Amino acid sequence: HFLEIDKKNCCVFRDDFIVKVLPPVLGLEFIFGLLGNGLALWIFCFHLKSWKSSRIFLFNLAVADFLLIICLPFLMDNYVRRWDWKFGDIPCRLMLFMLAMNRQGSIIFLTVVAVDRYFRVVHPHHALNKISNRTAAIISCLLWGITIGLTVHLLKKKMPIQNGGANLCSSFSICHTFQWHEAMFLLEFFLPLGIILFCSARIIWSLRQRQMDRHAKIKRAITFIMVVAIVFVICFLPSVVVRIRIFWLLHTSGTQNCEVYRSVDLAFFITLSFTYMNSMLDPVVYYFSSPS
Amino acid sequence: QSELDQLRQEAEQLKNQIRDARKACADATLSQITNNIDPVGRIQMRTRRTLRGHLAKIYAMHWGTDSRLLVSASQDGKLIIWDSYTTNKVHAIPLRSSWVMTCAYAPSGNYVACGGLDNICSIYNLKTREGNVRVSRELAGHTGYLSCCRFLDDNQIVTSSGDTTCALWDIETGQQTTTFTGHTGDVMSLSLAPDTRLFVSGACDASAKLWDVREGMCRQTFTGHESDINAICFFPNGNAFATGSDDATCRLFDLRADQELMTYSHDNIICGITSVSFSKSGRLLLAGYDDFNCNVWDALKADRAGVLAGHDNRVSCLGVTDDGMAVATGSWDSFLKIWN
C-alpha cells in the first residue's frame, strides 16, 4: 500500500490535492510566462537590430525559458487526471529531457549574466568587457553543449513507468537509490546562488564606496540587482529545503513506512510549481525593465 | 572716416545696378518654360552592393574615371580603395592624422589625395615598383582645415580651406601657384568645370563664386541662400551649377544669365543638405540630407521623383559614376551603398 517498484525499492504516490491546486496555477503561469517570453523574443529578433554580448546572453536565457514554457500543457494534462500518462512513450522522456535541460540552462545563463555585470562594474578596464559577437556565441554554444551533455542521460529512461494500472513520467520520486540527479538538483541551486551573491555584494559595495550612488539613476540599477538576487532565492529555496527534509527522513527512518513520505511528496510536488515563477517573472525583470 | 563711407556707398550703388541688370534679364522662369514637359516616372532604384570594413563615420568618397574603382575616407584613420563590381578591397592606406574630411582620386588613376583637421593635403602614389602605397608629397600652406580637394592632372590640384581661401598647387615642387581670397567665410566645397578651366566654391557666408584658374580672379558672385552652403556641383553641360545649403533647399544658377533659376524644397524637409550631384544627362538631381535619407529631384520642374532610404545615420557624401550606371552613398553609420 502506497509502495511501488522501480529498479530498486521506490515509494511512489498518487494524491488529489495536486489536481485540486496545481492545474490552475500552472495554467496562469503558462499564460503569463508564454506571453512575456514571446514578446521578449519578438522584440529582440525584430524590434532592435543592434546586438552585443550581453544581449546575446539575454537572448539565450530567453530562448531557454521559451523552450521550458512550451511543455506546460503536457503537465497540465498529466495533472488534471491524477497520474495517467496517456500521451505515448517518446513524449515522456522527450518532455523530461526538455524540462531538465531548460531549467539547468536558465540557471546557468542567469549566473553568466550576473558574472558579466560583476565584471562590468568592478573591473571596468578589462579585456572581457569588449568582446565580439562571435566569441559570445561560441561561449553560449559551449554552455548549451555542457547542459545538453549533462541532461542526455534522461533520453535513455526505460519508457513510461507504470504504478499498478496507472502511468506516470515522474523521476522525482522518494526512491531508495543514490542517484546523481538529486545531487545535481541541489548543486545547480547551491553553487550558482553563491556566485550570484558574491557578484551582487561586490557590485553594490564597489558602486557605493565610489560615491557613485548619489546619482539619481544608479539607484535603479542597485534595486534591480537586489531584486534579481531575491527572486532567484525565493524561486529556488523551498524546493531544496523540502528535498533536504526528504533526504533526512529517508536517512533516519527508512522506506518501510510512507505516510510522512506522502506528506513530504505533496509538499515537494507543490513547491516544484514555484520554479516556473522564475521563467514567467524574469522577462519583465530582465528584458522589459531595461531602459532600451 | 569719410572716404571709406564713399567707397561703401559706391559699392552699394554698384550692387544695386547689378541687381537691376539681373532683373532686366529675368523675364521668364524655368518653371514657366518647362510647364508642358512630361514628368519622368517614379524612380525605383535599389541597393546593389554594401561595402563594409570602415569602423567609423564616412566623411568623403570619390569615384574613379573608369566607373569601377572608388576611394573612401573615414575617421578611423583609414583610406580604402574598393572594387565596386566585386566589393573586393584593393588597398588600405593608414593616415598620419585620423581627422580626415576630404579625399580625391586622380583622373589618371595614379594618385589619391586626402586632408583634414591637420591643415595638410597629402598625396599618395598608388603605382610604385614596390608593393606598397607611399606618401609622395605633403602640401603645408593653409592655416585652416582642408574641406575639399580636386585633381586637375597628375601635377596640379586645387584645395579649399577653413581660412576663407582656395589655392592651386604644384605637386612636384610643392608650392602654392595661385591664391583665391574673395570669400569672407569658411570655404566648404568646390567643383571643377568639365573642361578644367573654371571652378566654383561655396562658403559659410552663403555665397558661391566662380574662379578662373589661369588669372586667379572671381568673375561672378552668386547669392540667395539664407544659410551656409555645404555642397556644390556643375551641370554636365558646363553652364550651370547647383548648391545645397543648411536651409534645407537646393538652388540652381546659370553662368550666362548670372542669377538663380529654380529652387528645390519641400515643406516636410527641415534638415540640412550634405551633398549634391547630377545624373549623366542632368535630368536628375540627387541630394543627401541629415534626416538619414536621399532625395531624387526632377531638375527641370522641381518635383520629387524618388527616395533612397537605407542608411541609419546621416548621409555624408554621394557621387555618380562617369558612365551614369550607379550612385554611391556614404553615411555616418560606416557603410557605403551602391544604388542602381
Added chain:
Amino acid sequence: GCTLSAEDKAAVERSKMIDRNLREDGEKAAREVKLLLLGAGESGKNTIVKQMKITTGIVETHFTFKDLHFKMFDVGAQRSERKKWIHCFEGVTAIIFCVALSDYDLVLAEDEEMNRMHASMKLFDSICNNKWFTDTSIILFLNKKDLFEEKIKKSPLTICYPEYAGSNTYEEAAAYIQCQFEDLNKRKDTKEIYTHFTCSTDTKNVQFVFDAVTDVIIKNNLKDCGLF
C-alpha cells in the same frame, strides 16, 4: 565559388587579409581613452598638458597611467568656426576644460567691455549645451589658484561678480567660482562636471583624470548590459 578564375581567387584572398588587418587595428584603437582639451589661451593649458605628459592644426598628446593609455587632442590652433568641425569629436570619453582663477580682474585685449572670466563662462556655456555633447562628462580644471590667493587680498571679487557678498578668504571665493561654473549646465541629469583646484600639484591631476575617466567608463559599461 568555383566560377572564379585564379587571379580572382587571389584578389579575394588579398581582400580577406586586408579585412583581418583592419579588424586588428580597430581592436587596438578601441582600448585607448581620448580626451578633448579646451579653454582659453591664458587659461593654463600648458602646465596641464605638460604635467599629465611627462605648425598649425590639431595637436595630439599621448601618455599612460596604470596600464591605461590616454590621448589628448588640443584644438586651440583652429581659428575657424567651431560648428563645422566640433562634431568630429562626438564620442570622446570626456572633455577637459581649463580655466585660470587669477583672471577675474583682467579683461580681454580684443574688447575692453568683455570681461575675461565672462568670456570663459560663455565658452563653457556654448560647449556644455551642445547637441553633440549631451552625454559627455566634463573634467573642469581651475588652474591659477595660488595667484588667486595672492590677488584676492587687494582685488575684490565684485570687480567680476557685482552680486558677490562673501569675503576675501580663498576657500569661499573658490566655492563661488565653482558654483558659477557648475550651474551653467542645464542637462543636470545625463552628464556630470568634475571640478578640481590645482596650482602646483604633482601627480594629483593625473589621478583625478583617471578617477573621472573610470567613473565615465563604468557608466558606459552599464549601457551595454541594459542595467542602466
Added chain:
Amino acid sequence: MVQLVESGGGLVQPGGSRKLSCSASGFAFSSFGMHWVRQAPEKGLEWVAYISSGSGTIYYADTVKGRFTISRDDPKNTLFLQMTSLRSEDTAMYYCVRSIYYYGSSPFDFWGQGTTLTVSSSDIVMTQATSSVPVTPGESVSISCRSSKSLLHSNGNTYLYWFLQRPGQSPQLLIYRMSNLASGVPDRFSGSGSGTAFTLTISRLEAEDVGVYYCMQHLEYPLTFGAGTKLEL
C-alpha cells in the same frame, strides 16, 4: 632597387636532397606571392610551385608534387624550396618570380637571376608554331601562339602573358592579359588575339630585343608555357 637572389644549387647525386633559398630586398616582400620556375638545359620554361601572400594557398605541379615543399620566412624576407629525392630530370636552372594579384596588377613582373642545380647522371597545352625566325633590324615580326582551350573568361579577361628571354638574361614580362604593355617595355610591342589564337607584333625591330619569346596562360593552375620561338639575326 628591386633584387632577387637565389642561393644553393651545385652537384647532387640521385636520391639525395638539397634546399634552395631566395633572398629579397627592395620591395614589400610580404604583400607578394612567389613562384618557382625551372628551365632545363636547351629547353623551355616550366612552372614548379606557388605560395600566396600569408602562406594561405600552395600549389605544386604534378611532376614534383609529393617531393618538393615550399615555404616563406616573411620576417627574414626569404623564400625556400626544400627538394627531396631528386631525379635526373630535375636538372635545371631555377628562377624565383614575384607576383601580386589585385584589380589592375601585373603579375610575374620581376624574375630573379636564377641558380643552377645539376643532378649527377586536363592541363591546357600551349603551342607556338615556328621555332626559328630570321629577322632584319627595322622590319616587323609576328610571333604567334595558340591554346587548346579558350583563355577568355566570363568576366571578359583573356589570361595570356608574353615573356622575352635575351641570351644570358632572365625572362622579362612584355604583355600581360594579352593586351596590356608592361611598365618599362618600349612602345614597340603590341598584343592581339581572340579566344584561342594570339599574336605578338614588333615594329622597328632593333638589336637588343632578339631572343626567345614565350606565351603563358594564367587561367587555371598549373600554369603552362609554350615552346619559345627564337628570333635570330
Added chain:
Amino acid sequence: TASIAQARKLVEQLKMEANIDRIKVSKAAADLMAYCEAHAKEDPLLTPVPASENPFR
C-alpha cells in the same frame, strides 16, 4: 587703414564683375532643356538598362 586697400579691392572687383554681358533667362532655360532632351537616351539612371547590360546585376 589696413582694410582701405581691401575696400578699394572690393570696389574694383564689383566694377569688374558688372561689365559681363548677360543673356535672357528664357534662352538659358531653353539651352538646359535642349541638353536634357538630347542626352535622354544616354542616361541609365532615368531609363533602366536591361539586366544583361547592368554590371551591378
